[PDB]
Amino acid sequence: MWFEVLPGIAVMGVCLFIPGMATARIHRFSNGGKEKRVAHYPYQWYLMERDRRVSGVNRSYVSKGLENID
Amino acid sequence: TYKYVNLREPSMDMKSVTDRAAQTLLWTELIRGLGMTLSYLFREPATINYPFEKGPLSPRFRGEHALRRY
Amino acid sequence: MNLMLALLTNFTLATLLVIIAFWLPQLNVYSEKTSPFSMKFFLVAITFLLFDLEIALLLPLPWASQTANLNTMLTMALFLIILLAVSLAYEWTQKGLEWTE
Amino acid sequence: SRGEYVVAKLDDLINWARRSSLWPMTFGLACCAVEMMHMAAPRYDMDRFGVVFRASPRQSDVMIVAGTLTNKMAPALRKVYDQMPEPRYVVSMGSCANGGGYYHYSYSVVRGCDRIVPVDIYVPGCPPTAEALLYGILQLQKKIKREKRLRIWYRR
Amino acid sequence: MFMINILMLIIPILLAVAFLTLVERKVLGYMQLRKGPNVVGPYGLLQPIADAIKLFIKEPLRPATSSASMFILAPIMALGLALTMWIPLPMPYPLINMNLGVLFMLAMSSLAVYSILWSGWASNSKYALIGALRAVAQTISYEVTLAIILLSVLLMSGSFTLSTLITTQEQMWLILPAWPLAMMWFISTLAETNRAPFDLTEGESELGFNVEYAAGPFALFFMAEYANIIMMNIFTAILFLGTSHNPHMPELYTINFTIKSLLLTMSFLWIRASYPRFRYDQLMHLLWKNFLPLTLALCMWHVSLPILTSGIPPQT
Amino acid sequence: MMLYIVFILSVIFVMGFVGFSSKPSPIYGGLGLIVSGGVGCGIVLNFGGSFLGLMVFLIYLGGMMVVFGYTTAMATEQNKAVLGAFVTGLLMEFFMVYYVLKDKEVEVVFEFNGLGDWVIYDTGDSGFFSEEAMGIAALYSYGTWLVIVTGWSLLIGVVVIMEITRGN
Amino acid sequence: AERVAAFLKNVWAKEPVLVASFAIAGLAVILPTLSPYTKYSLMINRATPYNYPVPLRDDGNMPDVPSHPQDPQGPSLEWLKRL
């Protein structure tokens, strides 16, 4: 019957879900649980590099809050 | 007796002419053809499960010659 | 560096499949087998090129709509597209878009 | 593990792939081509076995000769056979192709396609039923399943 | 971790292409009142694997090509570019977050014509060359409408960034304001990928260019061709059927976005089963006399419509 | 060795030019010009020009060069001089590369330097836009005269080519 | 009055695609002139602050230039919040 066509669709459907699911998880793993920063324009890049210097550890995604201010 | 297959005169009133403009621009009769193939997608296929099922035959079938005994 | 790795991986992968495709069956040993210019086609390519170039002048339109001279910008944007349509009309009427000899 | 065990299982993997994806090139010459179309029709649906309906000569694994092979046609048949990439099998369908059939004693008919190309399976009938050609195709699958190319190379 | 990311994109693409062959054979079967592969594995789930092994252990031809170096360059270029067109796709986060991603996909897509042209030369056959010339003229003709239609849509979006199309459709699909463009974009994607009713190459009784290829090299052209069918339908869904993105539950986006991308890929198989084939002179007239006049007119309309409603999108 | 990416690309740029400048068969000559075009875009991208670099792929490689190859396959009927020229070209490239990498200063018509292209890049930018994109978008606000003459020339190109190719 | 109707009703029957193309292109050239919202497009484009608003040295006679951003003097985007 027609529903015997679905199992092929499920495999094809799952294979198109892995690339999207993998990229989202790998970014969070590599960016300390946050989305990967988006820097399309020079101003955004300048802030990101500044965050690298302010973190102490040379990482753009380690955010320092008020507790870092005297 | 005989009949004509393709001897129609299409009307030239505005409503009829607009009907064929919608058909030309909005692809009405092409989508009418997609629906027919959609119906067959939900019909039970006519395939039999050979070699576990066999095609019907009749007592008059002519196959392998053979020699009989009394 | 990321975009460089992505291109390297895709084409490196394609090369591997190609060479192992021409050799894997050659690990097998099968017995050796032994033993007009068309003008209309050229005009399609040239018509595409001149149309393709005019598209190059239209790609920056989305950024061009951010200006403070919209009256001037909208006048030239419709001029380029109108001129592109004039070229199509000229070929159409001069039998350029035909495939019959 | 033994070498004779790995080769036995590798032979089963290549045989399984080859007999499960037979792509035929059909030489429809005469009435026997009609019965071959009924094997592709919904009743029997050769495609559900992996046997595609139509394949080009260079993408094909089996040649089905369905109809009468004439003397004016024989050179074309041999040329198509020589250009088939290997492995390649030939199925002879119908009395005309098997031995000439009703036109055996004609001046313009090759008496059997097996004197022009090698033949693996003969399907009798005039024409064979679409369920008789299908039985022949499944008999070619089992023949490919018995191949032992790797088990004979390992003993050379 | 980026290298792991690339492999998490490439392998699933090839697996999806492998099982698209099965799904195509079964959807076509049921629309024809039959079944399709259901013997090689349960419901034909092992049919793709059998076909792959068979092709890669079959002897290749490699005729007396005039070059023998274009014969090997053509499938590398086709498959290499086909995988490259996936790297900027937001699903919902791109592998490579390009600022001009929409323009990157046009650029890489216009290079796929060389593999069609080079394989024509390598075959060394005069007739095979004619088939390559007709295919090339088809591809370049229909990417004129891909470029202009895309420009018209981006005038309602404001950038060439692919992830900005997600923001643009945060209140409503672009299919609603731009359905006439969607129609001519959908048909233009069939012609680009040599799909029925535009498959003159595979349309025997008139010609294909990849006729001298067998075994593995043939499968490489096949894999690239089908990966482009999935990619173009993923592009269409992003462009005209935007899926809402929730930053806390990105998997929700991927499931909805995949379902749309599958439904549009099955529509390609649906259209193949329903219509006869265009003549070569007739698909050219469908572009130079019907689509192009409308595409140019709609481009004028979409340059002016945002201005006269005060609806110009932000640059950033 | 990643800091000298621009110079490495330029070296590949020249080698491609020596490829089709030696004039092998047109099929291979066009192949070498596609490689140089791709490398040429790579250089432009690393200087901050993204729209210009991509315009090379879409219009030059995917446009003109496709018409060149398309016309070659249909009107071209598919030696020591070629090899002699090709070997001569590479040697001059090697010596120019060798000297600019030894003393980092070469004088051939102009005074060239060998420190590295990175030393002349601007050190300050905090804009919320792409300076290259803003300039190209100015074609419609500032370049009114440019648009008219360019469009008219393209229109005349259509008229002229049909006149030339009619043959009667 | 009857000549135009006969002409229009014939292209609409034989060339519906071209009839649609010219109607759409014709609206792209006319409506912006008659549209009352075209003036708001320019104001929105002029209001977008890409650059820094460099301050002006105070001389004493500048009552129209605010001393602080939150003073009531200067251009106002109230019209934009309601558009």
Ligand SMILES: CCCCCCCCCCCCCCCCCC(=O)OC[C@H](COP(=O)([O-])OCC[N+](C)(C)C)OC(=O)CCCCCCCCCCCCCCCCC
């Ligand atoms: C207020 C301002 C409003 C401005 C905008 C107003 C717009 C008004 C409407 C304009 C018309 C709409 C354009 C429709 C496109 C017309 C293109 C055309 O050329 O038509 C004639 C063309 C050909 O017309 P023809 O062949 O009959 O004849 C042309 C004219 N003569 C007779 C002189 C030759 O039709 C086709 O395109 C053929 C279709 C090929 C087969 C396609 C299969 C269709 C499968 C269904 C797909 C459904 C779409 C899926 C979309 C999914 C998207 C996610």
Ligand SMILES: CCCCCCCCCCCCCCCCCC(=O)OC[C@H](COP(=O)(O)OCCN)OC(=O)CCCCCCCCCCCCCCCCC
């Ligand atoms: C101010 C800024 C804008 C300025 C724009 C000026 C440039 C316009 C560029 C347009 C693009 C070029 C197209 C020009 C070719 C026109 C078509 C043509 O070549 O004529 C061929 C046609 C052949 O005639 P035949 O086939 O024998 O018989 C049936 C004909 N209907 O002969 C014909 O009978 C065709 C009749 C002439 C076509 C007239 C087209 C007028 C289009 C304007 C419509 C605007 C309406 C907008 C309002 C819509 C409101 C809903």
Ligand code: SF4
């Ligand atoms: S064997 Fe019988 S059915 Fe087949 S071609 Fe001959 S006569 Fe016709």
